[PDB]
């Protein structure tokens, strides 16, 4: 009996010997009523760790399985989940391991490559999918992805990043890894070298095992003070939406988009012809013409190809719900929001073939949050009686009638409001209609402008006041998701609660999107500036257009409760419509 080989039957290679396996009575209850205890068999250290968090550990393998493993699960209300993975990508990579940590037992551990009963997993699955257990993951999204794409199915989580990260409030980049967390909030120091192991091989290190189990483990006492710490700064409304918006977001993720090679490869010879075409002739129109051909050819064109998966023609990019200043959504790899803004390009990207398109987008969300917190009356009320926001200052400017108001006041308006609503000055006002909307105004047109407006919008006035005068650093959304400055910036304030309210709204959208969407088997696609993509069976076409209508009016109207919100909707075949 080596040491090395003492545990083949278990898929344990003792390097250390460090390992003990023991076999205790441990105090469960029967299915039935009964309080009954039953022997099990576990895995412990010699050396005892410096901590307080559970080491011990239960393997479950197709050799040794005992049924009564699973009558640990009786009961429970929350437990701490975590994988342990081959790779990264979950189409080219497995999970290795599935490790649950129930309060006061040693880990249970999945051996997934030494698994081939579907009887073991029923006990498992059944946890996971049971709405009324809370899994507390740390990076959720990562886990999710792999579980749902195994066809594990799983509701109710709590993500530990999640909660650091909103704790936070934006003043670190850096730091929301599992030790990091754990040292700040239990500390504790976890030994994080065996992240870099191999779980490739159907034989697990000694210390590998004991790694996964802590990390699972300290979910559970990282979950309550987290908890806590949350609830003290009035965070739950946000953490809970950000939690709930996981799902979607993988179902975004995994579902990816489709791209029409065709529209592709021509586009590209077309552009192709251009750029050659313009550079024979050009070798301010020419630098424009080329400039712009070489961007939209090479930095377009040209990088898409990439991201297509070769056997689906699916691109599959990477959605990030924190790493944003104002709360928003980002996309990366490709990102989204990158993208050419234009008809013909969006135009390649299209849904499957029985499915189709559903495109909803927000009307002035933005000008209408401002009107909301800040209880502007004018606004208000003009808003409630279906008047455009630049239709009113247009009146207020020229002191015309909506009857007498042409396209050209009405311009002036978008840059009147566009420019002062977020805090510009008469002078960025000139310079900024001069520049985005060619008005050649003067200074003095512009000096009244800025007097009329602020004299109207009393409500916008007493809001900017206030804001430069407080010259706070701490900001709060109507979610009460909170943000620090590291120094005061008119601007970034007066965009905050805005950008971030829209954040809140966008994100609640997708959770009762993502729920009211099952019956009908919908696809959530993407989800870009004000703007979401889902993708249906066009079966179910004028269903699925009421639902997403009706979830994102639903999300607007659970934050804003003085202003409605306006979705305009389209039915498409293609991106570009
Ligand atoms: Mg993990």
């Given at each position: 009996?080596?040491?090395?080989?003492?545990?083949?039957?278990?898929?344990?290679?003792?390097?250390?010997?460090?390992?003990?396996?023991?076999?205790?009575?441990?105090?469960?209850?029967?299915?039935?009523?009964?309080?009954?205890?039953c022997?099990?068999?576990?895995?412990?250290?010699?050396?005892?760790?410096?901590?307080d968090?559970e080491?011990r550990?239960?393997?479950?393998?197709?050799?040794?399985?005992?049924?009564?493993?699973?009558?640990?699960?009786k009961?429970?209300?929350?437990?701490?989940?975590?994988?342990?993975?081959?790779?990264?990508?979950?189409?080219?990579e497995?999970?290795?391991?599935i490790?649950?940590?129930?309060?006061?037992?040693?880990?249970?551990?999945?051996?997934?490559?030494?698994?081939?009963?579907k009887?073991?997993?029923?006990?498992?699955?059944?946890?996971?999918?049971?709405?009324?257990?809370?899994?507390?993951?740390?990076?959720?999204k990562?886990?999710?992805?792999?579980?749902?794409?195994?066809?594990?199915?799983i509701?109710?989580?709590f993500?530990?990043?999640?909660?650091?990260?909103?704790?936070?409030k934006?003043?670190?980049?850096?730091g929301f890894?599992?030790?990091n967390?754990?040292?700040k909030?239990?500390?504790?120091?976890?030994?994080?070298?065996q992240?870099?192991?191999?779980?490739?091989?159907?034989?697990?290190?000694?210390?590998?095992?004991?790694?996964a189990?802590?990390?699972?483990?300290?979910?559970?006492?990282?979950?309550?003070?987290?908890?806590?710490?949350?609830?003290?700064?009035?965070?739950?409304?946000?953490?809970?939406?950000?939690?709930?918006?996981?799902?979607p977001?993988?179902?975004?993720?995994?579902?990816?988009?489709?791209?029409?090679?065709?529209?592709?490869?021509?586009?590209?010879?077309?552009?192709?012809?251009e750029?050659?075409?313009?550079?024979?002739?050009?070798?301010?129109?020419?630098?424009?013409?080329?400039?712009?051909?070489?961007?939209?050819?090479?930095?377009?064109?040209?990088?898409?190809?990439?991201?297509?998966n070769?056997?689906?023609?699916?691109?599959?990019?990477?959605?990030?719900?924190?790493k944003?200043?104002?709360?928003?959504?980002?996309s990366?790899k490709?990102?989204?929001?990158?993208i050419?803004?234009?008809?013909?390009?969006?135009?390649?990207?299209?849904?499957?073939?029985?499915?189709?398109?559903?495109?909803?987008?927000?009307?002035?969300?933005?000008?209408?949050?401002?009107?909301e917190?800040?209880?502007?009356?004018?606004?208000?009320?003009?808003?409630?009686?279906?008047?455009?926001?630049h239709?009113?200052?247009?009146?207020?400017?020229?002191?015309?009638?909506?009857?007498?108001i042409?396209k050209?006041?009405?311009?002036?308006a978008?840059?009147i409001?566009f420019?002062?609503?977020?805090?510009?000055?008469?002078?960025?006002?000139?310079?900024?209609?001069?520049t985005?909307?060619?008005?050649?105004?003067?200074?003095d047109?512009?000096?009244?402008?800025?007097?009329?407006?602020?004299?109207?919008?009393?409500?916008?006035?007493?809001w900017?006041?206030?804001?430069?005068?407080?010259?706070?650093?701490?900001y709060?959304?109507?979610?009460?998701?909170?943000?620090?400055?590291?120094?005061?910036?008119?601007?970034?304030?007066?965009?905050?609660?805005?950008?971030?309210?829209?954040?809140?709204?966008?994100?609640?959208?997708?959770?009762?999107?993502?729920?009211?969407?099952?019956?009908?088997?919908?696809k959530?696609?993407?989800?870009?500036?004000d703007?979401?993509?889902?993708?249906?069976?066009?079966?179910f076409?004028?269903?699925?257009?009421?639902?997403?209508?009706?979830?994102?009016?639903?999300?607007?109207?659970?934050?804003?409760?003085?202003?409605?919100?306006?979705?305009?909707?389209?039915?498409?075949?293609?991106?570009?419509?």
């Amino acid at each position: 009996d080596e040491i090395t080989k003492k545990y083949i039957k278990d898929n344990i290679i003792n390097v250390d010997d460090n390992i003990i396996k023991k076999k205790d009575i441990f105090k469960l209850k029967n299915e039935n009523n009964e309080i009954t205890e039953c022997a099990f068999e576990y895995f412990e250290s010699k050396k005892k760790f410096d901590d307080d968090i559970e080491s011990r550990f239960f393997i479950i393998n197709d050799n040794n399985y005992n049924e009564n493993i699973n009558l640990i699960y009786k009961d429970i209300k929350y437990c701490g989940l975590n994988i342990q993975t081959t790779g990264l990508e979950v189409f080219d990579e497995n999970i290795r391991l599935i490790q649950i940590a129930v309060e006061n037992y040693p880990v249970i551990i999945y051996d997934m490559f030494n698994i081939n009963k579907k009887d073991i997993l029923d006990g498992l699955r059944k946890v996971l999918e049971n709405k009324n257990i809370i899994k507390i993951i740390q990076n959720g999204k990562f886990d999710a992805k792999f579980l749902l794409h195994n066809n594990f199915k799983i509701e109710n989580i709590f993500d530990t990043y999640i909660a650091s990260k909103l704790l936070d409030k934006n003043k670190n980049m850096y730091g929301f890894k599992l030790n990091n967390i754990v040292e700040k909030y239990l500390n504790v120091i976890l030994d994080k070298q065996q992240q870099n192991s191999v779980w490739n091989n159907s034989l697990l290190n000694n210390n590998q095992l004991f790694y996964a189990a802590r990390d699972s483990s300290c979910l559970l006492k990282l979950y309550k003070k987290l908890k806590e710490e949350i609830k003290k700064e009035n965070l739950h409304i946000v953490n809970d939406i950000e939690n709930k918006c996981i799902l979607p977001i993988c179902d975004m993720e995994l579902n990816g988009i489709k791209v029409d090679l065709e529209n592709l490869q021509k586009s590209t010879n077309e552009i192709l012809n251009e750029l050659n075409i313009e550079k024979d002739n050009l070798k301010i129109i020419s630098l424009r013409n080329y400039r712009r051909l070489y961007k939209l050819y090479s930095a377009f064109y040209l990088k898409l190809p990439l991201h297509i998966n070769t056997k689906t023609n699916k691109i599959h990019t990477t959605f990030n719900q924190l790493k944003t200043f104002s709360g928003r959504f980002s996309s990366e790899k490709p990102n989204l929001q990158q993208i050419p803004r234009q008809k013909n390009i969006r135009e390649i990207f299209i849904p499957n073939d029985n499915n189709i398109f559903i495109i909803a987008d927000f009307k002035q969300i933005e000008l209408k949050i401002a009107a909301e917190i800040t209880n502007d009356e004018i606004m208000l009320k003009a808003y409630n009686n279906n008047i455009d926001l630049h239709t009113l200052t247009a009146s207020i400017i020229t002191k015309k009638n909506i009857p007498d108001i042409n396209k050209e006041d009405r311009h002036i308006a978008k840059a009147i409001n566009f420019g002062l609503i977020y805090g510009m000055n008469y002078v960025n006002l000139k310079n900024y209609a001069n520049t985005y909307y060619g008005l050649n105004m003067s200074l003095d047109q512009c000096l009244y402008f800025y007097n009329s407006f602020f004299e109207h919008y009393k409500g916008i006035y007493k809001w900017h006041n206030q804001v430069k005068q407080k010259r706070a650093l701490q900001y709060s959304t109507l979610s009460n998701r909170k943000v620090i400055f590291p120094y005061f910036s008119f601007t970034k304030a007066l965009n905050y609660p805005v950008q971030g309210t829209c954040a809140d709204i966008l994100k609640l959208a997708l959770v009762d999107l993502y729920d009211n969407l099952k019956d009908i088997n919908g696809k959530i696609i993407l989800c870009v500036h004000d703007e979401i993509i889902i993708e249906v069976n066009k079966k179910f076409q004028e269903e699925a257009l009421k639902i997403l209508v009706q979830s994102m009016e639903n999300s607007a109207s659970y934050f804003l409760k003085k202003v409605k919100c306006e979705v305009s909707v389209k039915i498409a075949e293609n991106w570009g419509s």
